[PDB]
Structure 1
Amino acid sequence: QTMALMVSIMWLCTQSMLENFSAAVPSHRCWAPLLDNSTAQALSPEALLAISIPPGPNQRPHQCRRFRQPQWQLLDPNATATSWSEADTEPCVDGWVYDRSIFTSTIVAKWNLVCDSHALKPMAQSIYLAGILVGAAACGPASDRFGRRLVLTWSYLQMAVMGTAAAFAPAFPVYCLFRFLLAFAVAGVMMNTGTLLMEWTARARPLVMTLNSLGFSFGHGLTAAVAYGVRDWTLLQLVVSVPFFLCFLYSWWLAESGTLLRMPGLRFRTCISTLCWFAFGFTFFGLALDLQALGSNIFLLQMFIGVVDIPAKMGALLLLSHLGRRPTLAASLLLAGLCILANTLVPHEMGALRSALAVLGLGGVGAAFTCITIYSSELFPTVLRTAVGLGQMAARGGAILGPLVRLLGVHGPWLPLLVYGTVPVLSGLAALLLP
């Protein structure tokens, strides 16, 4: 039925967005003896934190350096500011402490994802998306040979097992492998859902595609409340994977109660489609995974993203039916690109405006995804329609490369967002040439 696949391409969105909350990095500082030892450290904890940790980014105490000896020269206003030397610091050998106000436990606070290993979280997202790519590439022959229902049930069981395992992962590589297998099963379920919704009913293909997109949006909106309700990432993953264990009951229906010509032929349309899919993947899996910097409140940001993406992807079908495929797609791409660029243009103090621009950009890239999905069914004739598979593969590759460009934040906090805003502009300018 349609409602079952809607629930199960919600919970998939919930599982995908769980990385945006479980991998969130709270405000952390170096473990200092004058702040975490017994009472003998003494009053005025702010002064102790200032004299125990040097300043860093955003005029805040350095999250990566600690003073070996208390520098009393910094607290006295009669002494000059920034008088300490670099040799007085240490590379945080004693460890780090994290703020338990917003999140009680995360994968960053558990395995100490700090500046020395800050690339692990984008590397974790890249490994997750690589597992998605591997699953989407492998489940093809599996679904073609063993049947779609068998591979669907196996992928559901694998999802549940890997979620339950990652909810209690003792090490970082073990958690990475668990996420890799979970992404394999996620991509299997995604491919099965797509290939089933493409030919179950269909004239109603755009209608069922927009229904699946609205289900995805419902999942986007529900995962925010789920993360707001559960402050522990372990219990969060547990209660997110439990619905898959419940949906596993539908196995076996309650127990019975090649195509390489896409490159030479229509090469222009092919490369344009792969470029749009790559751009969509890039922006979506680079922006939806770092919502902490795009707004002030991650839960409210995701809620607004969902509540504004619902009508956007709703009216996307009206726009496609009235104005056409190419013009509305180019318009949505250019709008998303301009919004993400203005998100870097606006100062960081305008948090509400930054959040609104992020929501608008996410709605625009979702509308662009809907538009390219509708357009892929008509860009190529029936004799060439694995063009859609190549487009999805290019989108998954762009997704994989997504978190890898986030490492450019060392050279500047706007460079990843600058790329995420510049790519859709060129994507729309290239799609404007479509027939």
Structure 2
Amino acid sequence: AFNDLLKQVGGVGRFQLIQVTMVVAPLLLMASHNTLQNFTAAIPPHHCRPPANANLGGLEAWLPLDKQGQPESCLRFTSPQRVTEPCIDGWVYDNSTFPSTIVTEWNLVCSHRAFRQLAQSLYMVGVLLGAMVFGYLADRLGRRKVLILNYLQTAVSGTCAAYAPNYTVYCVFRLLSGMSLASIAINCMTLNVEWMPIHTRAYVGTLIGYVYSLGQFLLAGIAYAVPHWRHLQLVVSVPFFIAFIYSWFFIESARWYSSSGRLDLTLRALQRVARINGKQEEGAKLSIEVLRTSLQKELASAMELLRCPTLRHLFLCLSMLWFATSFAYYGLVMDLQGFGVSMYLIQVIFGAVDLPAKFVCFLVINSMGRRPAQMASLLLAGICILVNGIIPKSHTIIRTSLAVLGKGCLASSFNCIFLYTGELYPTVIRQTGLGMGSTMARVGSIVSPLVSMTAEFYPSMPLFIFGAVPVVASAVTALLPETLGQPLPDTVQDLKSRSR
């Protein structure tokens, strides 16, 4: 087995530490890139600019007032103070907090407000495309080469977005940045796991969860330090140039070399790692014949998820769970400005709640089971979001606390569904099923900004939709079997025997 060779060349040695750390470091900026528009697309207060030929009755004589006494954002009087007209001459933006965003840069307000959400969706479209395209590319070219390309693409596209001369160019490059960043996240965990012993593989996924949580803190600090969107976009993008330079020194996974029919490449990688780990004597004992015997034994389709009636029910129910969790998650975390508290503080608190959420999810999963944990986390998240849509916006502390609880619950939902999905699918299709679940989540993050556009017509409709979907999904979990205390199924036959 390949695990025996890995233990022979050092187990979790110096090479594993160095390479895993270097590969995992860009996931710190992953959260910044995923939710950057909260700061780069922040919406400052705005109103119509008065006619140029007019002399400032003053500005108040030109602006109709809303029900709360504030000037209207999208209408001005045709004559100084009652015929209203849109902002023909543009808008005046309050620059006290956010001096420059893509909203102020390209006037993404009023009838053009939806372009802000379209840009977010196009980013998530790139994330979806990058998962599929670079998932195939990593298999043909290897994890190391694709990571090298992804770092360069992320650095170049993110920098180009910072220097975009118009909205269209910004969207194109944001989409390209999402393409490579999705591959970075996917191939970071594939490359690191393939170089780690099987009994340490769960720690790799756990460490990645801690890194993403730390990235939310990092975005808060960077955005607060760098308010200007062009500078902010640039500053989270150029670190990937550094990763691109040192990624050349990555060692491709010996397991991928063997699966590609290159044992001499497998041998060279293993001996290099043995040299780094101080196990040169063990590495010098390796040979193509030794590798051939060990990997002889080790060396279904996604359509079977729909062709098999037994696998179809699980796939459909899990797809709803994966979709809803992501759909509600990005519905909530991309609406930071809507809580009335400073977005930097909320971003900090949102990152902090991930840690107790995992601990509480860990406690519930092992005690009650995966199904009640998945049910409760989705149900409570939905209720929290739904109640947030009812409470008036003036109650900032209550609404923010509910949002934090809802965000923590959805983080627990993410933690449970990944573990639940693997124990639900048989070993023949488990990797395909986990990939299809992650795909459904990526679809949810595409749809979520689109639903957010409905706030233009009904201000509270997005929150109701973001809350209703997980509540419905919480009922879907009731159709799933409980996996706590069960052996992992191997074939679809095991699935039917378990049900019987």
**Same fold per TM (> 0.5)?**
yes
Distance 1:95 1:355, change over 3 A: same
The verdict on how the C-alpha distance between 1:186 and 1:65 changes in structure 2, with shifts beyond 3 A counting, is same
Greater mean alpha carbon deviation, residues 50-59 or residues 108-117:
50-59
Letter in 1 for 2:470: P
Aligned to 2:259: none
| Residue 37 of structure 1, CA deviation | 8.4
Are the aligned partners of 2:421 and 2:433 in contact in 1 as well (CA < 8 Å)?
A: yes
In the alignment, the residues of structure 1 paired with residue 336 and residue 375 of structure 2 have an alpha-carbon distance, to the nearest angstrom, of: 25
One-letter code of the match for 1:202?
Answer: I
1:280–1:226: structure 2 CA closer, same or farther, 3 Å change rule? same
Q: Distance in 2 between matches of 1:284 and 1:107?
A: 23
Aligned-residue offset at 1:378: 1.1
Q: Deviations over 1:52-83 (max 9, x none)?
A: 11123643211111122211xxxxxxxxxxxx
Map of 2:90 onto structure 1 = 95
Measure the CA separation in 1 of the matches of 2:457 and 2:168. Answer: 28
User: 1 CA distance for matches of 2:106 and 2:457?
Assistant: 25
Out of 418, 422, 426, which is 1:381 matched to? 426
Aligned residue among 434, 450, 456 for 1:410: 456
Residue by residue over 1:268-296, the C-alpha shift from the partner in whole angstroms, topping out at 9 and shown as x without a partner, is: 11111100110012112222112111342
**8 Å CA contact 1:206, 1:317 repeated in 2:** no
Q: Within 5 Å, which residues of 2 pair with 1:212-251? A: 212-251=208-247
Question: Secondary structure of the equivalent of 1:29?
Answer: strand
- 1:11 maps to which of 23, 29, 33: 29
Give per-residue Cα distances to partners, 1:164-219, cap 9 Å, x unaligned: 11111111101110111111111111221233355434344443323211211111
1:111 aligns with 2:106: yes
Are 1:214 and 1:314, in contact at CA under 8 Å, matched by a contact in 2? Answer: no
Cα distance 1:346–1:406, how it changes in 2: closer, same or farther (>3 A)?
same
Q: Is 2:379 aligned against 1:334? A: yes
Deviation per CA, 1:91-114: give whole Å up to 9, x if none.
211111111111111000000112
In 1, are the aligned partners of 2:354 and 2:411 still within 8 Å (CA)?
yes
Q: 1:259 aligns with which of 302, 322, 339?
A: 302
Q: 1:295 to 1:221 in 2, by over 3 A?
A: farther
Contact 1:308 1:359 in 2 (8 A): yes
SS at match of 2:47: strand
Equivalent residue in structure 1 for 2:117, among 84, 104, 122: 122
Identity of aligned residues (%): 43
- Counterpart position of 1:54: 64
1:169 aligns with 2:169: no
Structure 2 CA distance for aligned equivalents of residues 246 and 319 of structure 1: 41
Name which of 22, 27, 32 aligns with 2:50. 32
Indicate the residue corresponding to 1:144 in structure 2: 139
Q: Which amino acid aligns with 1:59?
A: G
Distance 1:432 1:221, change over 3 A: farther
Q: What residue identity is the alignment partner of 1:324?
A: G
Residue 395, structure 1, aligned to residue 427, structure 2 = no
CA distance in 2, matches of 1:230, 1:57: 35
* Residues 317 and 53 of structure 1: CA distance in aligned 2, closer, same or farther (over 3 Å): same
Distance 2:213 2:222 in 1: 14
When residues 37 and 192 of structure 1 are mapped into structure 2, their CA distance, relative to the original with a 3 A threshold, is: farther
Assess if the C-alpha contact under 8 Å between 1:28 and 1:97 holds in 2.
yes
Residue 134 of structure 1 deviates from its aligned partner by: 1.0
Change over 3 Å in CA distance of 1:285–1:198 after alignment to 2:
farther
Give the match for residue 286 of structure 2: none
Displacement of 1:16 in angstroms is: 1.1
Aligned partners of 1:388, 1:234: CA distance in 2, in Å?
37
Residue in structure 1 matching 2:407, options 347, 362, 373:
362
Paired AA for residue 288 in structure 1: V
* C-alpha spacing 1:37/1:185, structure 2 compared with 1 (3 Å): farther
What is the SS of the residue equivalent to 1:93?
coil
**AA at the equivalent of 1:67:** F
Is the contact made by 2:41 and 2:103 (CA closer than 8 Å) also made in structure 1? yes
Aligned-partner Cα distance in 1 for 2:366–2:157: 42
Report what 2:330 is aligned to: 285
Unmatched runs of 5 consecutive residues or more in structure 2: 1-18, 252-271, 277-300, 482-500
| Matching residue's letter, 2:61 | I
| Structure 1: tracts of 5 or more residues without a match | 42-46, 72-83
Change (3 A) 1:58 1:122: farther
Aligned to 1:10, the other structure's residue is in SS state helix
Over 3 Å counting, the alpha-carbon distance change for 1:317 and 1:123 in structure 2 is same
Cα 1:322–1:6 change in 2 (3 A) is farther
Q: 1:341 to 1:201 in 2, by over 3 A?
A: farther
Identify the residue that residue 22 of structure 1 maps to in structure 2. Answer: 40
Report deviation, 1:249: 2.2
Letter of the 2:385 counterpart: I
Higher mean displacement: 293-302 or 174-183: 293-302
- Contact 1:295 1:301 survives alignment (8 Å): no
Q: SS of 2:100's equivalent?
A: coil
Equivalent pair of 1:197/1:209 in contact (CA under 8 Å): no
Partner of 2:178: 183
* Amino acid of the structure 1 residue aligned with 2:146: V
